[PDB]
Design a protein around this ligand. Sequence first.
Ligand SMILES: CCCCCCCCO[C@@H]1O[C@H](CO)[C@@H](O)[C@H](O)[C@H]1O
Ligand SMILES: CCCCCCCCO[C@@H]1O[C@H](CO)[C@@H](O)[C@H](O)[C@H]1O
Ligand SMILES: CCCCCCCCO[C@@H]1O[C@H](CO)[C@@H](O)[C@H](O)[C@H]1O
Ligand SMILES: CCCCCCCCO[C@@H]1O[C@H](CO)[C@@H](O)[C@H](O)[C@H]1O
Lengths: 257, 257, 256, 257, 266
Amino acid sequence: RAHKETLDKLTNAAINKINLLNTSKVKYLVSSAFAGLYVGIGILLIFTIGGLLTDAGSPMTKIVMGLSFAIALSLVIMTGTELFTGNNMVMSAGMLNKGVSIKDTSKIWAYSWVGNLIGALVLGIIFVGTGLVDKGPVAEFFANTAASEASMPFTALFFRGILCNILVCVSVLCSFRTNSDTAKIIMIFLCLFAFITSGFEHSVANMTIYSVSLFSPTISTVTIGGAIYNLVAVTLGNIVGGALFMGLGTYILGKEK
Amino acid sequence: RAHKETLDKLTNAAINKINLLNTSKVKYLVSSAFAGLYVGIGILLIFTIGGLLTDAGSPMTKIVMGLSFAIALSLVIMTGTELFTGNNMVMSAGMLNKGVSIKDTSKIWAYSWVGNLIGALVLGIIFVGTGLVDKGPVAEFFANTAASEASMPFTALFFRGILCNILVCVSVLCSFRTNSDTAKIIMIFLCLFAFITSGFEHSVANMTIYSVSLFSPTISTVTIGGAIYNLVAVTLGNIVGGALFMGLGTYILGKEK
Amino acid sequence: AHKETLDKLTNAAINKINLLNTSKVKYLVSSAFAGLYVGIGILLIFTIGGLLTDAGSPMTKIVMGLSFAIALSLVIMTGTELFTGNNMVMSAGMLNKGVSIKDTSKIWAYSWVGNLIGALVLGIIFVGTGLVDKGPVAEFFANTAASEASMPFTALFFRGILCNILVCVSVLCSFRTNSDTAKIIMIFLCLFAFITSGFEHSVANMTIYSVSLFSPTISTVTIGGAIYNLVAVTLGNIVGGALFMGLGTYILGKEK
Amino acid sequence: RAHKETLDKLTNAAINKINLLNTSKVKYLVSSAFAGLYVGIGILLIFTIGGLLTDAGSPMTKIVMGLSFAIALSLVIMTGTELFTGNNMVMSAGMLNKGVSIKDTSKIWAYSWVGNLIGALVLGIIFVGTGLVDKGPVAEFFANTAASEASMPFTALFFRGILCNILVCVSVLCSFRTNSDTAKIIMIFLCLFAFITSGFEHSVANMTIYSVSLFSPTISTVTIGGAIYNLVAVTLGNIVGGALFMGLGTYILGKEK
Amino acid sequence: RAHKETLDKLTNAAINKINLLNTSKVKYLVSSAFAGLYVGIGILLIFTIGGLLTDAGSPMTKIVMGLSFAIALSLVIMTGTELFTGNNMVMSAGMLNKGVSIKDTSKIWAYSWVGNLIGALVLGIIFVGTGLVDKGPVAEFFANTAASEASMPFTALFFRGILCNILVCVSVLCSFRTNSDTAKIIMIFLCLFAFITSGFEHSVANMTIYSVSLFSPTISTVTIGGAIYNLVAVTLGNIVGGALFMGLGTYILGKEKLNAAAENLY
Ligand SMILES: CCCCCCCCO[C@@H]1O[C@H](CO)[C@@H](O)[C@H](O)[C@H]1O
Ligand SMILES: CCCCCCCCO[C@@H]1O[C@H](CO)[C@@H](O)[C@H](O)[C@H]1O
Ligand SMILES: CCCCCCCCO[C@@H]1O[C@H](CO)[C@@H](O)[C@H](O)[C@H]1O
Ligand SMILES: CCCCCCCCO[C@@H]1O[C@H](CO)[C@@H](O)[C@H](O)[C@H]1O
């Protein structure tokens, strides 16, 4: 228990985030684009695995996918880049602790979400260019997954987005509470294993699901309207999980009253 | 060997726990709610695994479940939050060592148990909201497990609770005896793998098994009366394991006499 | 750093006898914990053994070896007293004139009996869970306890030698590093090797026999068979830990 | 975030590389040959795995190959040797940051690529001498892979080269951002898993694919022309991924404006 | 870098080895016996695994064996004991760097090789005494492997020995280049996985394969002449990999060009 010091670090991180954005939109957006791309890389890997194992009829598909997703947030944390979903916890705890304003929070949320999407778009374009989703099990895995995501009821997506960002943000929280980089990566691995395999939903990961499916001329299951519907529901859920649960929660634990 | 140093750390932790509760019930209960939910997240994952592998008739089911439970206690330790089962050893050692009273101990046990339950209930509600236990093998795995859990004889549940909390508290004990966060997680991973795969029972984990079964309209196998029966039996077993083995044991090892 | 390592072994031996001389209760409680922690590893890998044997898997013994690390990891991380590690520590310390032959036999006897107490307590409580009432796990304990008790003395003895070379070398590694993670990894590798290769650990066997004798489910064991196995394996363990690891580390480290 | 410190570290590493080369072509080329060989060693392992599992008809082939390739970059990083693909990010960031010139960069690129190729040639010769690709599934895996790699469309290989070197360079970037050797190896393990299993292309790894295929008297439909074609397309993609994405991006993050 | 400091550590390690040997033949040979035994322990495990999975028809056999061999060199490195194959790189680098003589090197190589053999012999006898290779698939795996190893052409064995000791010595090299014991062990795990699964040959591991064959009554069919032939070809390959690739390689990386005080890199 060093909840107070932890809240101090979250607050200092929120302050530094808005300071960076005020200093340089380009640096901020570039950082955000990296993080979106790094998360998408995890999606490329586990959807390749999904295609390979689904084709085979394996019962381990979802387990292997969850075990293999760690790289997504590991890369974000180890490169120090800006991820929308972690910003839900960091900005809300900072705002509650009076380090940043509500306008700082919406600004960081908006720019990091958009920058993240830019990363996912760039990745999607390059991945299609590889020819790796022209035809076959990986293309089909993207196609079928994107369509099921776009047709899932709003309540289901919302609540899955809540549980997802509790796991993502708590993995970010762990990284603020240890000085061991290996422990950070292990905690990320566990949290991402839990969230992927349990069936929870990450807004930024989903950007790459849709970017690949939409840019691919051979994937014809989904549509931009579908992408928006899914992303809105999941983003809202992520926000509630990261800001209302983790942000508020860590403020309560840490605030010297 | 460092047994005295270890007892001194346990004693300090006990003192700090009761001081926290006395200072702020809200901070104490929020921490307890977090721990209950973090442990439940482990349940959500391994029961999803349960449902996936049982439906497939796999012999590795229980082994993969044990291997995948580590997140539950790893989150608790890395976030510094309040878990009832760990408090059995810490408060008992601290009490024997005259750092805290019997009343402090009973108070910490009651508040952390109830707070853990709040966390489990909240998690259950949100998990049911995902639509992930509407129907299918995961819902069925919850429903079948919850039914067999509340129909097991008291004595079997009690003894399963003892062995479970020897393992949970010894992994907490290890965390008091190393400065390496990675060693802490590895020891937690081993102990949780042992207790889940061997078939031991954790009261706080069971809260989430029962919260999901209670909230899901598709799960109609267990009853409030049965959940209560299981929880009492297992809580009592956990208490004997944590306080009478680990608490008393570590006091005996460390006390300068 | 062989000299420094021998000094650490010698200091550890001196601390063990000083502890036993100061408090039999503290010493036996530490030993009981260690016996119970090793036994917890057996409950886990025999559960695994029951599950996979039932499935006719070819990976049974490999998964069992990979999954046993907790046994010595707990002992090392809790600083508790394990008979088998004491075979190397006390012999190195005795050769190096930190402790006496009589101190060594005394530590060996107390830690062996303390470990046994931990195994018995564990066996009783595990039987109480109802988890070996019937089914593949109960059958795996019963069948393993039976085959262990019928193996020829010489086979058990040599298996005990190789087992304690591996257990004591993992303890030796723990004296040679300041990294707790490295300690656990080396323990994991050594227990993997010894379990999967089919070697025998006296203290682990105490839990095998405590479960088997406390479970009312019918086996072909008997107390005579259990004692037979424990004696043969204990003797092999002593040779592996004291004559190989203890003498060897003394030779490497002694400033002559 | 420590983006400025990181950019400074990249720049210092670029200055060190060109100073090394200017000091001794022998030392520089020997270092480069080692790295080419270390990478190639990863190829021998995973192609042996490819052969064994492909022969068996396993659906896990590409997954186990990805999991098993970590040694390639782990050796390079832990030995401090010169790898062409890593040099794409490092020299470009250092050049942008005015620590080295464009001429230095192209010189480092040329020497490290040729040096890496020398190490791949030596490895291939020696591996063929073992008799391990005289015949059988491993020999056939080399022969069929080499052939399919050489007949892939230019654009496909190019985009595959881009995504590969984003992953290789970001794992190198991680090594500059932590002091933990274990964390370095873990991130490398993750990045190499992702790039191999997803199907992306590494110029230096391909040098060993082709050295083995061409030196082995057991017959394929490859040819020197096919090898060069593949190596050029993939090298160009690696340069873009390493220099235009990672080099430029890390410069933008770290540059004080 | 840091090649110069790595060369210094190699050189100092070479100096300490010959000093130890000069000081006490008994200490040096006991250290070597330990290392031979520790490596052999890796063999007993992975040949047990070999027997289990071969009998079962698994295609994962050689992969699982490679994954499970890490203990062999991890024990050597974590106990600080004397392994012939590692000494190929260490003594050659230190020799090139003028810390030890050619005679020091040949001596360390001779004593460590024989010492390693002693440990493998002791291990083989004790392992046969367990009765674990009286009959069955593990017995057959040891026996079949021993026979096939003794009948492989010299050139194949030689080249396999080169690649193996590049891997073993590079893992020893990583251990000089880090202060993290866990990193040392991970690099050892990766290098041994690569060398075992790829099919490369280790002289000291082969000593235990043959010692188990020597003492197992359930047939040898192999021949002392055959074992010797295998051991010589693989030992020579190992020497080339460790000394000519790794030893000379690390000397070249590490030696500061001023000196010149004899010779000229360019
Ligand atoms: C590639 C260019 C990306 C530009 C993304 C800009 C997104 C702006 O987003 C807006 O930012 C405002 C603060 O300026 C906030 O007040 C608004 O809530 C928010 O919608
Ligand atoms: C949601 C509100 C939760 C409040 C839980 C308080 C329950 C207290 O419960 C009681 O606490 C006493 C000390 O105060 C102890 O002595 C008793 O053993 C315990 O039953
Ligand atoms: C629970 C009670 C267990 C007590 C175990 C005591 C076993 C004593 O054991 C004996 O101790 C003597 C010194 O006291 C030594 O001289 C002997 O070598 C040793 O066998
Ligand atoms: C034995 C191997 C020797 C390889 C030496 C390669 C020399 C490369 O030299 C470099 O080539 C670049 C393009 O290739 C040019 O842009 C540089 O001007 C030139 O210095």
